[PDB]
Design an enzyme around this catalytic site. Structure first.
Site, short mmCIF file in Angstrom:
data_model
loop_
_atom_site.label_atom_id
_atom_site.label_comp_id
_atom_site.label_asym_id
_atom_site.label_seq_id
_atom_site.Cartn_x
_atom_site.Cartn_y
_atom_site.Cartn_z
CD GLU A 119 24.16 3.72 -3.18
OE1 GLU A 119 24.19 4.64 -4.04
OE2 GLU A 119 23.13 3.42 -2.53
CG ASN B 26 20.12 13.23 -6.78
OD1 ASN B 26 19.83 12.16 -7.30
ND2 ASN B 26 21.10 13.36 -5.89
CG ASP C 44 16.73 16.71 -3.90
OD1 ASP C 44 17.46 16.16 -4.76
OD2 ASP C 44 16.96 16.66 -2.67
CB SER D 32 20.51 16.72 -3.11
OG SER D 32 20.04 15.49 -3.67
CG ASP E 83 23.37 10.90 -4.44
OD1 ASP E 83 22.90 11.39 -3.38
OD2 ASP E 83 22.66 10.41 -5.34
CG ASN F 285 21.39 13.59 -1.01
OD1 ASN F 285 20.87 14.47 -0.34
ND2 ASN F 285 21.31 13.53 -2.33
#
Length: 130
Positions: A35, A46, A49, A51, A53, A60
């Site tokens: 990750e 992102n 959308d 968002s 992380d 998220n």
């Protein structure tokens, strides 16, 4: 902070992650490795959308933490996303435990499915004294 392998394995063990909800330490280590490369300030936007992380677990903003800029998002871990960018991983660990209390469990992270699931992850904790 970018954790070294075994240092991270013992840190997770101290925070109660070993076998939490049936998830071994090796699984968590494989997740974190893929990750963020064990990096607590790793962050990923992102654009599809809106968002983001955050941190070592790459949690998220749409459902887990509040950054105030993700549309229609919630904050299930009841934390500012800034809490997931600290060198101390206690808050991120509490949030990751919250994530796995859900149905999917460790499967919440697609990366875990891609490179940890049904694999030999023994190598991640070997020699760490955990």
């Amino acid at each position: 902070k970018v954790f070294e392998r075994c240092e991270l394995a013992r840190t997770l063990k101290r925070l109660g992650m070993d076998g939490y909800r049936g998830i071994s330490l090796a699984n968590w280590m494989c997740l974190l490795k893929w990750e963020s490369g064990y990096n607590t300030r790793a962050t990923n936007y992102n654009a599809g959308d809106r968002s983001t992380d955050y941190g070592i677990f790459q949690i998220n903003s749409r459902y887990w933490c509040n950054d105030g800029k993700t549309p229609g998002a919630v904050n299930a871990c009841h934390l500012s996303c800034s809490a997931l960018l600290q060198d101390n991983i206690a808050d991120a660990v509490a949030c990751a435990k919250r994530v796995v209390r859900d149905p999917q469990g460790i499967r919440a992270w697609v990366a875990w499915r891609n490179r940890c699931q049904n694999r030999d992850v023994r190598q991640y904790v070997q020699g760490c004294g955990v």
